[PDB]
Design a protein around this ligand. Structure first.
Ligand SMILES: NS(=O)(=O)c1ccc(N/N=C2\C(=O)Nc3ccc(C(=O)O)cc32)cc1
Ligand SMILES: NS(=O)(=O)c1ccc(N/N=C2\C(=O)Nc3ccc(C(=O)O)cc32)cc1
Length: 293
């Protein structure tokens, strides 16, 4: 670690603290992530697999440094996250062609992850990174279930529940790649409307916000929902609202795709591969964002 000079702290999450840093050996500017914990052997092996999960839309994992019973991950550095870009673009909105490009690229990255049986599990605007060339990349995944212990909130953590799939909220512990499609759907809606789709601050508030818009799920729309671990027959039964309120003024192709990404039944929810073929992407392009760095 004496080979890195910290420039500034750029983030913190369940798995650690991220710094912008300079590699003293090469002069490179990188993102250095100190993993919050020595470190178990299963975590070293699982993280080593992430070094081989390489794609243009996945943040590059350059090196794994396991020394003095501490774990550091060295990643390539990108200058801005989607949360900041969304906030910077709040008065005008991100242009639809750029929203479409970002969605397409993130579906390409997820289709790749998913084909290798790797789930992101916690997609949110803060872990989607952008550059000046129009790329967007997935970050902050691959360490879940590798440390062998139940997840406990770290000191000062406030968990973001806004993008969590309903099956996670309902207590499914063996959920599928569909959870990432749900999260990406929520982010897509937020890019279009400039408002979070389901901004809950508790698990039940999150679940009830989903139900009030999409309707309380039942066995008709989601076979098996009533047998989910945290499903209660006492949930209020809200009717599904007319979808026209969800993402105005998005066109029917985008609304159709979003409705497939937000299906309750994870088995009915569209896959990343099928979403890439949706008519909404027939006119996809790769525009340049205006980034103020
Ligand atoms: N792939 S890259 O990001 O374009 C890049 C850029 C710069 C570098 N430099 N490497 C080195 C540099 O300047 N002094 C060095 C001293 C020692 C070593 C070494 O391997 O032992 C490497 C460098 C690499 C990649
Ligand atoms: N808020 S901001 O100023 O727009 C910002 C936020 C984040 C960044 N970079 N983050 C990262 C980066 O460059 N490589 C990474 C690799 C992994 C992780 C992670 O969390 O696991 C984060 C980053 C820059 C500016």
């Amino acid at each position: 670690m004496e080979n890195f000079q910290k420039v500034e702290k750029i983030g913190e999450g369940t798995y650690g603290v991220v710094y912008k840093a300079r590699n003293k050996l090469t002069g490179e500017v990188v993102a250095l992530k100190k993993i919050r914990l020595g470190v178990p052997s299963t975590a070293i092996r699982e993280i080593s697999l992430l070094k081989e999960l390489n794609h243009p839309n996945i943040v590059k994992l350059l090196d794994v440094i396991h020394t003095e019973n501490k774990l550091y991950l060295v990643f390539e550095f990108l200058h801005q996250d989607l949360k900041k870009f969304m906030d910077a673009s709040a008065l005008t909105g991100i242009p639809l062609p750029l929203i479409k490009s970002y969605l397409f690229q993130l579906l390409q990255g997820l289709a790749f992850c998913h084909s290798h049986r790797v789930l992101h599990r916690d997609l949110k605007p803060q872990n989607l990174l952008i550059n000046t060339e129009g790329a967007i990349k997935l970050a902050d995944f691959g360490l879940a279930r590798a440390f062998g212990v139940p997840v406990r909130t770290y000191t000062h953590e406030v968990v973001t529940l806004w993008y969590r799939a309903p099956e996670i909220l309902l207590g499914c512990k063996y959920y599928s790649t569909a959870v990432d499609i749900w999260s990406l759907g929520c982010i897509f809606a937020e890019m279009v409307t400039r408002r979070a789709l389901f901004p809950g601050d508790s698990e039940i508030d999150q679940l009830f916000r989903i139900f009030r818009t999409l309707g309380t799920p039942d066995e008709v729309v989601w076979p098996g929902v009533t047998s989910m671990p945290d499903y209660k027959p006492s949930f209020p039964k809200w009717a599904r609202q007319d979808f026209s309120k969800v993402v105005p003024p998005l066109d029917e192709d985008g609304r159709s795709l979003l409705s497939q990404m937000l299906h309750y039944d994870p088995n009915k929810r569209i896959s990343a591969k099928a979403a890439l073929a949706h008519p909404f992407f027939q006119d996809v392009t790769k525009p340049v964002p205006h980034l103020r760095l």
